[PDB]
Amino acid sequence: EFTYSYLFRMISHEMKPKADQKLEQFDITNEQGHTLGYLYAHQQDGLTQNDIAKALQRTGPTVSNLLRNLERKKLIYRYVDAQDTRRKNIGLTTSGIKLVEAFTSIFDEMEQTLVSQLSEEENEQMKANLTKMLSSLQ
Amino acid sequence: MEFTYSYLFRMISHEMKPLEQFDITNEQGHTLGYLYAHQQDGLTQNDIAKALQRTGPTVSNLLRNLERKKLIYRYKNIGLTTSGIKLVEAFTSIFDEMEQTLVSQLSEEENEQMKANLTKMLSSLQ
C-alpha cells in the first residue's frame, strides 16, 4: 500500500525527540551524527568536505565549522589530497570509530519497544534487510 | 555490533529526502502526508510547523494555498478534505524510481514483511 519513503519519513518524524536526546549523551549535534554515520559508511572510498556538504545539503561555512568541531575532538582527521589539491579528504580516527559504533549500537527504551513487537528470528531478518536497503542507498 | 532501528530509520530517512503532476510542492506533499498520518489527533499550525521543521509563518503560505484548493479545512485544528485525502493517497501510493530500487532489493514476501512491520512499528508510536 504505502511507499517506503512515506513510512520512513513518518517513523522518523515520530522518533526524532528521543533520537535527539540520545545524541546529547554523546555530545554531538544531529548533523554531526549524520556526518559521522556517513563517514563510517564510506571508510573504503574516502570522502571529502564537498562530499559532506552535498550529503547534508548544507552551506559551506556551516560544514567547515562542524568539521572543525569534530577534528578538535580528534574524532576525524582532514588532509589535502595528493592528485587534486582542491579537494580536502577526511577520515575517521580510532576514537571516532568507537564513538560511531556506540552511537549506532546502543539500546534505548524506545528501541526496546521497537524490538518488543517482534520475534528474534523476525528481528534478525528485519534488521538485516533494513541494512541491505541502507547500503544500497549509500 | 548491529545497528539500532533508530539509527537505520534516521539514516534511510536521511538518504531519502530530495511531485509536479499532482500540482503540489513536496513540502506541501509533506504537510498533506503528516496531516494524513495524524488525523485522529487533529492538528495545529504550531504542531505542523514544529513537526515540519519550519517557521510558523512559512507554513501559512502552504496552508493558504492548500485551503484555496480545498484540500484541507480547519476548525486552530487542521484536517484534510475528501479531495485532500484522495490526493494524499495517490501521492503516497505512487511507484517511483527510488521506490522501485528499494522494492527491487527484496522478495515480494520480504517486501510484504518489511512493509507490514514498518506499519506496525509506526502504529505503536502513533
TrEMBL record, chain B:
GO terms for molecular function: DNA binding; DNA-binding transcription factor activity. It comes from the Bacteria. PROSITE patterns: HTH_MARR_2 (PS50995). Residues 2-123 form the HTH marR-type domain. Keywords: DNA-binding, Transcription, Transcription regulation. PANTHER family: TRANSCRIPTIONAL REGULATOR, MARR, TRANSCRIPTIONAL REPRESSOR OF EMRAB OPERON. This is MarR family regulatory protein. It comes from Staphylococcus aureus.
